[PDB]
């Protein structure tokens, strides 16, 4: 939630600010890492209940 | 300056509370800070 | 008649800013309304 809200918030700025800085790609990497955690944990819970 | 200290900083013995982000070697005299003299 | 019954209300409200302003230690001690103070400078300069 924090990563998604921060990314959606930082997506808009003024015209001479909005860049692909050293913030946007770290937020995207955090979102991807959170996602991979999510499906890996789903799979691990499935093996656990099996 | 990138040092061995600044890599191992949240595990070093003599490092105070890292409340900020740039240098972990700031000073965070907030726990000591006697209760009558505290904000 | 509603006056005395509103005097209590008045106090209650005037005693709802204390539990906020005072509570913040960094306000009870060092306290300056930058805004009002800034004006006094500009006004004194105009004067």
């Amino acid at each position: 939630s924090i990563a998604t809200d921060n990314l959606q918030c930082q997506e808009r700025r003024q015209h001479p600010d909005l860049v692909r800085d050293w913030v946007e790609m770290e937020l995207l990497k955090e979102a991807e890492l959170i996602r991979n955690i999510q499906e890996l944990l789903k799979r691990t819970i499935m093996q656990a209940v099996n | 300056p990138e040092t061995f200290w600044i890599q191992r900083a949240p595990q070093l013995p003599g490092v105070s509370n890292i409340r900020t982000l740039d240098t972990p070697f700031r000073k965070n005299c907030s726990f000591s800070t006697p209760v009558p003299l505290s904000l | 008649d509603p006056k005395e019954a509103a005097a209590i209300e008045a106090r209650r409200n005037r005693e709802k800013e204390r539990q906020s302003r005072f509570l913040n230690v960094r306000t009870r001690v060092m306290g300056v309304d930058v805004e009002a103070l800034n004006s006094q400078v500009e006004e004194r300069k105009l004067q």
């Binding site: 921060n6 918030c9 700025r13 600010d17 | - | -």
Partner: protein, 49 residues
């Protein structure tokens, strides 16, 4: 007079860019860091270990 209007345009867009930069501080500082500061800790991400 041409020089004066040239400096005047420079001041115009300088205040433009300053307001732009200040609202960038507002969106970076007041929104995102404050919403980030409630991040859960290592033990909670481990699952109450």
């Amino acid at each position: 007079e041409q020089s004066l209007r040239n400096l005047e345009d420079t001041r115009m867009n300088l205040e433009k860019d300053l307001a732009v930069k200040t609202n960038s501080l507002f969106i970076n500082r007041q929104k995102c860091m404050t919403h980030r500061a409630c991040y859960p800790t290592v033990l909670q991400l481990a699952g109450y270990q």
